[PDB]
């Protein structure tokens, strides 16, 4: 009787008969540390043993503090980043994933809103990719469930909107093979998740009610950033993913238009002006003493995704690679043609002056202008004389501002001049 006894008995009998099987199974677990690094390996093994002991049980109030202390102790490890193969074969990522499942539980409860272990572990596991990409390959299998439970709110930057998308972004950082291995259903999932952000906003920051933090909303930009990471590469634009991404995005209208009429929307010529008139002088809320940057940042992220989604011309296929249809479709989304006036305006106002006046909170960022010029270069380009004869410059007001803001001052400079310098560095429109 007692079937556990006979189960263990026959397990032992088979394992002692098939010693070769135990030998081949045990070998991948084995590693080899050389000499001096024994001491720093012992502490890592003790910390991982403590983590594994706390894995089976759940976490509470003091247990989170203990886990964070253990993680702070394990971060200052010499052989953590020196032996990635040991790190992969030691099975830490499975432990962190199981801890994440235990923390989330059933879901839609959020008993403890403090994800800081997951971001640090994922970033430090995905920073190295020149050696042992098999860790990223392993995380690619968990990526489906990771995208399934993409909750809002990350404690590390005190932003909300997407908790675990940093792990996915680090997983598709600079891997063309991993980007090609992406499928359709997860892209559909993230498209439907993005489509749910079409609800209008009444206050400066509110999810359902009773606002607590009203600094800056970013809940609509994380999905666009993840799509941009999944559609582009180090120096190439993957067409296979771009086609399905643009087909899914264009199949249904999800970008709400707060100033246009009828179906569709996406009117820059009115929404950008509304954002710069509601965010420059007033606060993120309408009634405010003298939306916010969220709407304009969302539009810039969407523009960047669309620009990087456009196929590269005169590099692989130039008019003989089916890209004509998708180029015409992107051109059809004119308001999109007439974005030069949008790129011309300079709604920053440096203010400052004589009596100190430091720091800016509601300043227009040149990165959005860089996004507009990148989209223009990707879709239309400056290969024709008409654009040069219409513009003659990347911008009059920004260039005049850069020329004027040239002084050896610790207050007038080193606050906005760096952003303008980066924007000018990223401007390649006069090139080619």
């Amino acid at each position: 009787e007692d079937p556990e006894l006979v189960r263990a008995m026959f397990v032992l009998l088979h394992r002692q008969y098939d010693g070769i099987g135990g030998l081949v199974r045990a070998l991948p677990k084995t590693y080899t540390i050389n000499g001096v690094s024994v001491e720093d390996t012992i502490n890592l093994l003790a910390s991982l043993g403590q983590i594994r002991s706390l894995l089976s049980v759940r976490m509470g109030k003091e247990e989170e503090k203990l886990m964070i202390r253990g993680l702070g102790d394990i971060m200052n490890n010499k052989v953590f980043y020196q032996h990635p193969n040991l790190m992969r074969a030691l099975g830490m990522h499975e432990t962190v994933m199981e801890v994440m499942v235990n923390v989330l539980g059933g879901g839609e409860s959020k008993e403890i809103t403090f994800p800081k272990m997951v971001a640090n572990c994922c970033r430090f596991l995905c920073y190295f990719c020149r050696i042992s990409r098999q860790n990223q390959k392993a995380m690619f299998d968990h990526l489906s469930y990771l995208l399934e439970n993409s909750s809002v709110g990350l404690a590390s930057p005190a932003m909300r909107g997407s908790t675990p998308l940093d792990v996915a972004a680090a997983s598709v950082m600079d891997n063309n093979e991993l980007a090609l291995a992406l499928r359709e259903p997860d892209l559909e999932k993230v498209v439907r998740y993005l489509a749910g952000c079409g609800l209008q906003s009444c206050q400066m920051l509110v999810s359902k009610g009773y606002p607590d933090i009203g600094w800056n909303p970013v809940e609509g930009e994380r999905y666009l950033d993840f799509l941009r990471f999944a559609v582009f590469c180090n120096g190439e634009s993957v067409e296979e993913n771009a086609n399905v991404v643009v087909r899914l995005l264009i199949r249904r209208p999800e970008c709400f238009g707060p100033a246009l009429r009828g179906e569709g929307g996406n009117g820059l010529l009115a929404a950008m002006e509304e954002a710069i008139k509601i965010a420059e002088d007033p606060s993120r809320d309408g009634p405010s003493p003298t939306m916010g940057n969220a709407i304009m940042t969302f539009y810039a992220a969407l523009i960047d995704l669309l620009g990087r989604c456009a196929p590269e011309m005169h590099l692989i296929h130039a008019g003989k690679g089916e890209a004509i249809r998708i180029r015409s479709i992107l051109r059809s989304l004119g308001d999109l043609v007439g974005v030069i006036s949008i790129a011309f305006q300079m709604p920053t106002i440096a203010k400052d002056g004589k009596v100190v006046e430091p720091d800016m909170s509601a300043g227009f960022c040149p990165d959005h202008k860089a996004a507009m010029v990148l989209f223009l270069d990707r879709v239309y380009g400056i290969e024709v004389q008409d654009f040069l004869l219409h513009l003659l410059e990347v911008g009059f007001l920004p260039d005049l501002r850069a020329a004027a803001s040239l002084d050896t001052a610790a207050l007038s400079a080193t606050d906005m001049a760096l952003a303008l310098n980066r924007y000018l560095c990223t401007a390649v429109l006069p090139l080619l």
């Binding site: 089976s56 049980v57 976490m59 509470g60």
Partner: protein
Amino acid sequence: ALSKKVKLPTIDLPIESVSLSLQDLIGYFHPPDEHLEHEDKQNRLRALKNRQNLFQEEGMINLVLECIDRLHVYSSAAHFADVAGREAGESWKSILNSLYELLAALIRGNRKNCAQFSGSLDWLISRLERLEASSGILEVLHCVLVESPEALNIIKEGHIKSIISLLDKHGRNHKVLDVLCSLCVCHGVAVRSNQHLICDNLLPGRDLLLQTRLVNHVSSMRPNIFLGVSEGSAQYKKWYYELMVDHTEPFVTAEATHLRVGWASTEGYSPYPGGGEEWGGNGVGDDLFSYGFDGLHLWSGCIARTVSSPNQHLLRTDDVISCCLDLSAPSISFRINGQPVQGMFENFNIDGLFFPVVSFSAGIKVRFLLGGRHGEFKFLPPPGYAACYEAVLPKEKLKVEHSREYKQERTYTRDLLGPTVSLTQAAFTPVPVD
């Protein structure tokens, strides 16, 4: 329909029919009786689990539990029984236990449905506010712990203190401990959100803390000299004897070292190795009716009754001990190394009889000095006192015995000693007649 105290003959109250229905329902939810074959047992378990899940889904999305709670209006032992009909809650405990058992069985199901009894506070505190039965709560907590532990965070410090207090006002039933075992790790299935909080909270309450003792074994030694004091026909009232100790090293096993030279009350103190709620006592000066004398401390029943005397020290090597006896005027003084100590004892057990006794522990060596050639008195007896030799019976030789115990350490022979306290049976008194 009869909740609002309506007239009884207007609408019937069929207690017999509802009792029969409840009995049929409880026998209808019988456990599968696993002693039979595996196939039929598995079929019955599968049918029961599917039935319970479907009954759950049909029943308490918005009903069933509300009906049961509205049914639980029995808050008095016999007032509501007398008010409505002849009796109402004649068998409330059994039906409550069976209803909670079937509720927990429904909650178990296919290990995928635990919401109402594990994700709420009002129903849990309604269960905990009565505390009459513990079968249902144990079953639901065990099933939640097996499936997915999330009902232990509801249990706060107040509920733990209430459950522990059940062992105080109400006697032990071994079911409370089997419940508290389910509020712990249970070999792997644990959650440190609040279960470890209450586990740490079990300790400072001190209503669950238990005390264990570990004492060395001691024996009492008495000689054959019997005083035989009576009333009206008394013969002798003065006695004096001394004892010597050479090897008296302490700390042989622990602090529990017993070495007493005084006397204990014959009535009240008996050679019993244990017993009693107050740690009992198996030596001289151990019970409440004795006093004891180790030379320094005279406790009785864990009561501090130490004496004050110059040059206080243990009964070390070359330390004499003397004893004084009186019967007319109670005056007992103890002298060590020629210096009498304080702590005069008055009004002892005059009525009855008492014998010279001495207690000892392991690793001790004591000598008996009663007088004559057998005992050489180190110090002279006090004036008005006599040595413990005149009470020697003729046609016999004085010696030591086993102090009316059962059996010593014998290797081959196995003898049994019957009831014989002393030479007589009824009373230990002489026979003066006229």
